[PDB]
Structures are given as structure tokens and as C-alpha cells.
Design a protein around this ligand. Sequence first.
Ligand SMILES: [Mg+2]
Ligand SMILES: [Zn+2]
Lengths: 177, 150, 83, 65
Amino acid sequence: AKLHDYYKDEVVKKLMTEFNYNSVMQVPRVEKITLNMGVGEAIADKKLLDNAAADLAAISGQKPLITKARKSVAGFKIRQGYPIGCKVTLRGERMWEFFERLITIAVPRIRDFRGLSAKSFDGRGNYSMGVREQIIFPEIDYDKVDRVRGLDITITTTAKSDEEGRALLAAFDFPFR
Amino acid sequence: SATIALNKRARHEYFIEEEFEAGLALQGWEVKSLRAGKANISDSYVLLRDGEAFLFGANITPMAVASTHVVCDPTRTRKLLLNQRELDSLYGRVNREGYTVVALSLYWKNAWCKVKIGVAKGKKQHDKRSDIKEREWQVDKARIMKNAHR
Amino acid sequence: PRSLKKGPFIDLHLLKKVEKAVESGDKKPLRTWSRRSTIFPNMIGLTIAVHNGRQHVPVFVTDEMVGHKLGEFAPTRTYRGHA
Amino acid sequence: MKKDIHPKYEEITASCSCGNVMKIRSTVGHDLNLDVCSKCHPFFTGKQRDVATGGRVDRFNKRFN
RNA sequence: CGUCGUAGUCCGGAUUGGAGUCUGCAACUCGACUCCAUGAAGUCGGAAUCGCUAGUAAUCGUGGAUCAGAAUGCCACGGUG
RNA sequence: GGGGCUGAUUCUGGAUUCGACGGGAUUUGCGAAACCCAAGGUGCAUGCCGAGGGGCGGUUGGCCUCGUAAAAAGCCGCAAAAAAUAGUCGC
Ligand SMILES: [Mg+2]
Ligand SMILES: [Zn+2]
């Protein structure tokens, strides 16, 4: 929670002086961080889901929740109640820890990291964004993983717009372009 | 078993060199006729345009006219599904002097029709005589040897 | 190879052109038609469009090419795979 | 939190090639001793022009010019 | 005479980075020689198949023409046998 | 004019025709045609009337060139008319 409090002591002041607010509870706050990993190919091979869950636990110590299918689309040949992918959510201390670790080592990474996309807001400003594989984290071993398991991580916040989320991420030192 | 109309005359009429197990591409009302429906594979040969070695000679009888919108053409040029790796023989050793590749037979492979193709050439009525003479001569030599050695 | 005491084989004209480029301070490429000529250290920092018949291929000569021929950097055949 | 089902949680030193020392706690197990990080990446810590260069004179200008 | 002892071998000498040398105004495409360094493949090889009847098969080296150099190709020569 | 059985390689509700041929032409490096937007060079370039154009004529009028306006030259058609048939099979 070191970065948590260190940056929360300053984002409040900066946002309050910038957006012309009237209270401290109306500032955009980081509710949680939600990260899943689509392993939908596990229809024939269920071991892929287990490997993805192990990789996710190694990245952040927790137990991934298997989100079973609900509509069972024929296009992908899936049935409802079958393991398709796995998700996880981090709140508070875990959310801040994951945010710090993820941003710090993901800034120096695979391909011409000239910042990240500034148009990746989900309408309200919860900033879903994707990372290609799991070898990004030193948590995951380089030459021991069977495949690559990226992550579609959403920084679920309280932002009422996209510019407020951009300002909050820039204060949190996000790689914006 | 799963065999369908075959052209065994072309085996005697040509010198089969190599064979291809490539498949055939056909439209509706024809694959059902392959089960029953009087398909005939006579006068079968490839008609390479650029990479489109269609089988040209085949008469498959349409057994119904219940869909009276599409025009029926029993002499349609049927497309052929062959690997590009093995299609090099067909764009290669065909147009030297008289080389052809003809459809020897047609059968089923797990509800899918496979037409066997073969590279060959003509005989000019003098290779046929030599083949028949040798076929008879081996039999005659075996018979006379058996009779002599009792 | 050549005898150590004979010397390099830079062209009459190429030397004049590179001298013109180096005291004029121009960033435009200098096109050359010679292909068996050697390299001199004074061309470091210039763009040379060398001709092989197809295109004037550019060379941004580094400080790591003096003792060889400039033509090694520009092949003439066109092939990067059978298929 | 639940019982001992969640994996390892121990402090690890995030020492990079440059002079950065961190007290991260994660599950990698052994000490990190990692490599070039955000604090030494050309994204914003300088090197916006120093990403690639025209070689470096070594023993080439020797014995003849 | 010594030596090695049946082993990818002190066999096998190719590919590789660099070094000079012969050579012809110039060897990145494109020479050969050199020696230091990595030291590949290969361990008598299916169906088939070719050459030889005597100083010949088979092995060893040398010589000759082409040409500034660039022969496992070509033409010759003898020794063993 | 009526009923009845087949239009089903499963009569077994889950077929990569293995293959060529359309697909976001999903994907990884990359050439201004898989493209692309104010700085070192310092020359007479941008809108300017233009000039009718390669053997011949024409192009969205600024796709060629300039310096006081022009020869047009970078693409299409006239042109490059030879594209017309597995094999066996009258002389
Ligand atoms: Mg000569
Ligand atoms: Zn670092």
C-alpha cells in the first residue's frame, strides 16, 4: 500500500485543484482490478485451463475462478456449465500491489512500448486494456510455460468520464501517448 | 465395398506411371447420385487451365428435378482438390509430347468421394501388341518349363 | 587481394565528390557507380547511393567499414526463398 | 483470506541492472535479481534518441586508411 | 624403427570467424595456397548396376596441354602387382 | 382422386473433402503503394495563364517539366492479334 497512500495523498490535491470539485469523496477512486484469461480452447484440453490458473496464481497469489459458459454458442462448439476461461479480481491492498507490479515491469516490455492506447475506455472510464502474454512478469518463468496466456485487465474505477480516468492514470504515471 | 463407377479401360489404353488420391469437388444432387444415381466416369481427363485441373469427362445422371431453378448440366467440369505440393507434377510432366493424367476410379472415403488420378500416355496400337505378346510369352515360358521339368 | 604497399582503389571522381560533400556539409545522398572501389575513413557520416544496375541502393556508412569494399553491402541477385 | 491454499508470499529484492532497490513481496520464490526496468527504459527515462547508433570505431582504422 | 589399440576414433577435413601469400589495373557475387583455431557428415550403404582375361584389374606418385593464376575434369608415365 | 414407404452413410443431433478456390483478406517482420504529415541540403519550386502530350490520341486539370512559358512526360486505348484445346486416331 506504499504507492497506494503515496499517490493518494497527491492525486486528491491535484484533481481537486484541477477539476474544481467541492468534496473529497467525488474524486475518481480505484475500486478494483479485474483480470481474466480466455482459454476457450480448453474444450478438448482441460489441462490448458489448469496451466492458465497456475500462471495466474504465480503472477498474483490467489485462486482463479472458472467462469463457465452461459449461452453455449455452436460457433465455438461449447456447452453451458463447461469450464471456459478463468478470471480473478483484486480489491484494495491486492489491487494496489498488482497495479504497481504490473505497470513497473510491463513498461519495459516486448515490442516498441511507446506508451499505451489512450482510447481504451469502456464508455465510463474503467480502462480495460490487454497484454499479449504472461512472460511479461518475472513471476512467470521464461522457458517453462507450455503456451502464452495474456491478460485482458480492466482497472475498474469510479470515473464519471474518460478524461478524468486519463488524468488519474497520468497521475499514477500511466504510459499515455 | 465403397467402390463406384471406375474406368478400367484407360488402364489398358495407357501406361499408368504415378497415382494421386486427390478428392473431387462437386455441387448438390451429384454426390447423392454417387451413392445411387448412375454416375459414369468414361472419357475422363484433366483440363488444366492455370491451376484448375478440372475433370471434364463424366456423366452423372440427375435423379430429380424437384429444384427446378438451377439448370442441370450432366457434363459439368468438376473441380478437384489436390495439395499444391503434389500439384507440381501436373503443371510439370503433362505437356511434353502426349502425357495425360486420367481418372482411373472413384470411391468413397468416410462419406466423401475420392477420385483416383493417374499420369499416363498413349500406346499407338504397337505398345499394346508388345504388352499382349509379353503377357502371353511369360505364361508360355512357365508352361513349357513346367512341362519339361515334369 | 592486393599488395600491402600498392594502396587502395578509390576513384579519381569519387574522391572529388566526397571532398565536395565534406566541406559543403550537404545531407543529400552522393550517388556512385563504382562497384570494385574500396572505402576511405573520410566518408563516415555521409549517405552513398551505390549503383548495381537495378536501383541506387543507399548506404549510411558507419565507422565500422574502412578496410573492405563498399560493394559488399549491395548484392545484385533477387532471391529470398524458392517459394 | 482462506486457509493455506493461496501460494507463496515473501519479500523479494527487485534489483535491476541500474541502481534500483525495491522491497516487493510476490510469489516468484527466490530473489528476483531482474533486468532493465521502467526506471531505466528508454520510454521516458531519457534515451529518446539513444535507442540505436551507427556502430563504434574499434580496430578497423588500423594498418591502412 | 618407434607409437596409437578398436574409440565419431590422434579416423574422417568438410562448414565457420580472422590472418597474410601467389596472381593478374580489381577476388563481397567469384580464384587458389597457407597455417592457428570449431572440427560436419560418414562408420562398406536396398532394389538395381558397371568395369575389367596379365604386367591387365587394383593402389602410389609424377609429367603434359588451356591460361594473368583458376583441375577430383582431359591426355600421357612409370612403380608395385 | 386419395392414402403409405423413401428424398438419411448412418436410419449414430457433433464430418477439418487433408488438398485447390472466397473470407476480418484475424496473424509476425515490413518497400510511399502493406501506407505514411515543417528540417540538415539551398534551388529559381508551391496557387499562378499554362504546354497538348512516348510510334499515335486521351486521363480525375494541376498526375511531367519549367521561369516569364514550352518541348509535353510518369498511365490507358491505337497497340503485343498469334489465345483456341488430355490421349489414341485418313494419307
Ligand atoms: Mg588469361
Ligand atoms: Zn531496471
